[PDB]
Design an enzyme around this catalytic site. Structure first.
Site, PDB file in Angstrom:
ATOM      1  N   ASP A  44      40.439 -27.237 100.272  1.00 49.21           N
ATOM      2  CA  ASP A  44      38.822 -27.134 100.413  1.00 49.21           C
ATOM      3  C   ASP A  44      38.210 -27.009  99.280  1.00 49.21           C
ATOM      4  O   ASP A  44      38.458 -26.173  98.487  1.00 49.21           O
ATOM      5  CB  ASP A  44      38.558 -25.939 101.290  1.00 49.21           C
ATOM      6  CG  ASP A  44      37.098 -26.033 101.960  1.00 49.21           C
ATOM      7  OD1 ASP A  44      36.604 -26.656 102.984  1.00 49.21           O
ATOM      8  OD2 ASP A  44      36.272 -25.182 100.952  1.00 49.21           O
ATOM      9  N   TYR A  49      32.292 -26.212  92.771  1.00 47.73           N
ATOM     10  CA  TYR A  49      33.414 -25.493  92.294  1.00 47.73           C
ATOM     11  C   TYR A  49      33.577 -25.690  90.674  1.00 47.73           C
ATOM     12  O   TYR A  49      34.298 -24.996  90.140  1.00 47.73           O
ATOM     13  CB  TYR A  49      34.515 -25.533  93.214  1.00 47.73           C
ATOM     14  CG  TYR A  49      34.297 -25.014  94.355  1.00 47.73           C
ATOM     15  CD1 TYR A  49      33.135 -24.085  94.743  1.00 47.73           C
ATOM     16  CD2 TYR A  49      35.267 -25.210  95.630  1.00 47.73           C
ATOM     17  CE1 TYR A  49      32.748 -23.989  96.095  1.00 47.73           C
ATOM     18  CE2 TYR A  49      35.053 -24.827  97.018  1.00 47.73           C
ATOM     19  CZ  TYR A  49      33.595 -24.073  97.123  1.00 47.73           C
ATOM     20  OH  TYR A  49      33.547 -23.709  98.776  1.00 47.73           O
ATOM     21  N   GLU A 224      35.299  -9.849  92.331  1.00 51.18           N
ATOM     22  CA  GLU A 224      35.323 -10.471  91.053  1.00 51.18           C
ATOM     23  C   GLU A 224      34.016 -11.183  90.421  1.00 51.18           C
ATOM     24  O   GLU A 224      34.118 -11.267  89.312  1.00 51.18           O
ATOM     25  CB  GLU A 224      36.320 -11.387  91.017  1.00 51.18           C
ATOM     26  CG  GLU A 224      35.856 -12.737  91.637  1.00 51.18           C
ATOM     27  CD  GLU A 224      37.214 -13.599  92.038  1.00 51.18           C
ATOM     28  OE1 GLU A 224      37.812 -13.244  92.904  1.00 51.18           O
ATOM     29  OE2 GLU A 224      37.288 -14.650  91.087  1.00 51.18           O
TER      30      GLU A 224
END
Ligand SMILES: NC(=O)c1ccc[n+]([C@@H]2O[C@H](COP(=O)([O-])OP(=O)(O)OC[C@H]3O[C@@H](n4cnc5c(N)ncnc54)[C@H](OP(=O)(O)O)[C@@H]3O)[C@@H](O)[C@H]2O)c1
Ligand SMILES: NC(=O)c1ccc[n+]([C@@H]2O[C@H](COP(=O)([O-])OP(=O)(O)OC[C@H]3O[C@@H](n4cnc5c(N)ncnc54)[C@H](OP(=O)(O)O)[C@@H]3O)[C@@H](O)[C@H]2O)c1
Lengths: 319, 317
Positions: A44, A49, A224
């Site tokens: 995915d 990204y 994070e």
């Protein structure tokens, strides 16, 4: 081992895949490759990204070694917000195809029902929240359906097998279903015990749309990123309900969180930088949650959403 | 007295109106007429309410008697769910116009972002939940924007002054805005202290869309629904009373003012003359930041008008 789900498009999709969000460019290629060795077949990804070239490197390595053939890998990508205008849809897909080093993506999703002003690829890529004017958000008047029709054409041209959407609430999905010729095959949404949206899941599944859950571990993925909402939220991993169920079956809380979705026909795409977690995140289908277990986990639903465009610029997607 | 709100269409809209839902047919004409004599100029109606003919008689009587002129009355109607298909939109609107006995309506709203299978006017009117096949719900593939374009056309035809939407959640409104030539001027949604939806209000107002609130008294409006009956009344809610007793106003007046003071139009409906008066003159005190803060604490997202109850229609999920 990994069950396939039959999509409305006529293609199979692994019910367990490998998430690629926040997979560092430096180690992504290697981790994708290790994931393939560990039995993962679906990956995915997304233009946003920024690591599709590395994802592609990992897959190409596995193929060049003879571990798998292209047709055995299910590649998911997502059309980012700056590329909704029909004239830019194919350009964005082309960039994805070039980076992934493939001729077609198995699944291409509208990342968000949000249309940012187009930003040329050579100007900045991935653009993120950049809209061509400093840090200001600028939008384009492109209805969802216009973007969808551009995607339908790309399916006809053989560049995409199945198309779907992500981050769509019920009314929006309902309306798209009204104008679509190729029905969206997948609805990918944030889904974990703190945000269960049972009615959305029910409507989508009854309409034949396959649900892919993202952020199955809830706040974890966001700490994070130093997100305050997530940092302030007690983890699902240390939650007494999840822990008691895990202990009862002698499974890990992570396995219960993933099984809670899988058992209901929801596809998962857990992400992990850790090799040790690869096998575990793909072998949790070894026990059955009872009616009682579901009632207990249902109690954690509080409609807490970590991925909310309202936070970016008061975009009314979930209001 | 009653402040007007300038819509994105240029036209003005009273900020206080008279709701027509459930106005009995036998007395709707007289009640609308009395409301006009009482100071009301905006009448919120709908094809689904099944009394447009009578609301029309009331308005025609006030005009024939010279109490008002057509252009001093703002009539709102709503396109019901079975008439979203463009080829039927004008049919529905023509029926509303014939019933109200007018050449145009001031505001025509898409009642719900739901498209029921078309049922001829002659077969059943108002159709309600009937979709032409026993008690089964049947739907049509008519995207919102197709219906919207049919309305934009009716505006150019002179049959509608302003168009808008009702029961649209944020994402759907956002998408319609990307495709609308005439921007929806109004967003009519359920709005009360238990269902405040502040982010939707803020987004809509900022986009230039005017908000019309309905069910301003919350549970008091669906009381034979169990959900409402089993909900603590706002008229007896400690926070509302406190603020009401703090200004010597009724709880009802605080509930309406809370919306009005934020630029939201209201459309209360009372069968009782006294309240009829109360409902158009509640702008006699301001809420303080602290009042708003205390009221904002009541928001629990409790919704009484939900298509999910009809047939698991995902409008609010
Ligand atoms: N369309 C969208 O809007 C959208 C939004 C978000 C995500 N997604 C997709 O869905 C995927 C999954 O969501 P996500 O990445 O946000 O979060 P997630 O999979 O819930 O992330 C799990 C977090 O938990 C840790 N983890 C992984 N396996 C674990 C295990 N067995 N036990 C304990 N901790 C574990 C990981 O750390 P380590 O890495 O150190 O192991 C990671 O920080 C993404 O990678 C992406 O592909 C889509
Ligand atoms: N678009 C949509 O989906 C939608 C849905 C529902 C309603 N609407 C519209 O919005 C309007 C609001 O709905 P509604 O009429 O049920 O709500 P409402 O007018 O808030 O109903 C108030 C209820 O409280 C009582 N009441 C009225 N004024 C009062 C006062 N000053 N003090 C104490 N009690 C008072 C009334 O009974 P008495 O008559 O005995 O005083 C009435 O039963 C409708 O008429 C309709 O036009 C639109």
């Amino acid at each position: 081992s990994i069950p396939d789900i039959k999509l409305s498009s006529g293609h199979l999709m692994p019910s367990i895949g490998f998430g690629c969000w926040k997979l560092a460019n430096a180690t992504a290629g290697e981790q994708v490759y290790q994931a393939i060795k560990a039995g993962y077949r679906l990956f995915d990804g997304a233009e946003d990204y920024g690591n599709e070239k590395e994802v592609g490197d990992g897959v190409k390595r596995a193929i060049d070694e003879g571990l798998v053939k292209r047709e055995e890998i299910f590649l998911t990508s997502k059309l980012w917000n700056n590329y909704h205008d029909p004239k830019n849809v194919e350009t964005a897909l082309n960039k994805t195809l070039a980076d992934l080093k493939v001729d077609y993506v198995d699944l291409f999703l509208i990342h968000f029902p949000i249309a940012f002003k187009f930003v040329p690829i050579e100007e900045k890529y991935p653009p993120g929240f950049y809209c061509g004017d400093g840090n200001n958000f600028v939008y384009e008047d492109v209805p969802i359906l216009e973007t969808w029709k551009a995607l339908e054409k790309l399916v006809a041209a053989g560049k995409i097998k199945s198309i779907g959407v992500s981050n769509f609430p019920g009314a929006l999905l309902l309306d798209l279903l009204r104008g679509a010729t190729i029905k969206p095959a997948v609805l990918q949404v944030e889904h974990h015990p703190y945000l269960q949206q049972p009615k959305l899941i029910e409507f989508a599944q009854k309409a034949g749309v396959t649900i892919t859950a993202y952020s199955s571990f809830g706040p974890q993925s966001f700490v994070e990123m130093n997100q305050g909402r997530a940092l302030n939220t007690p983890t699902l991993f240390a939650h007494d309900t999840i822990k008691a169920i895990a202990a009862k079956y002698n499974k890990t809380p992570a396995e219960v969180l993933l099984r809670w979705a899988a058992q209901r026909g929801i596809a998962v795409i857990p992400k992990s930088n850790l090799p040790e977690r690869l096998v575990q995140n793909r072998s949790f289908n070894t026990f059955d949650l009872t009616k009682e277990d579901f009632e207990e986990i249902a109690k954690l639903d509080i409609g807490l959403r970590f991925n909310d465009p309202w936070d970016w610029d008061n975009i009314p997607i979930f209001v």
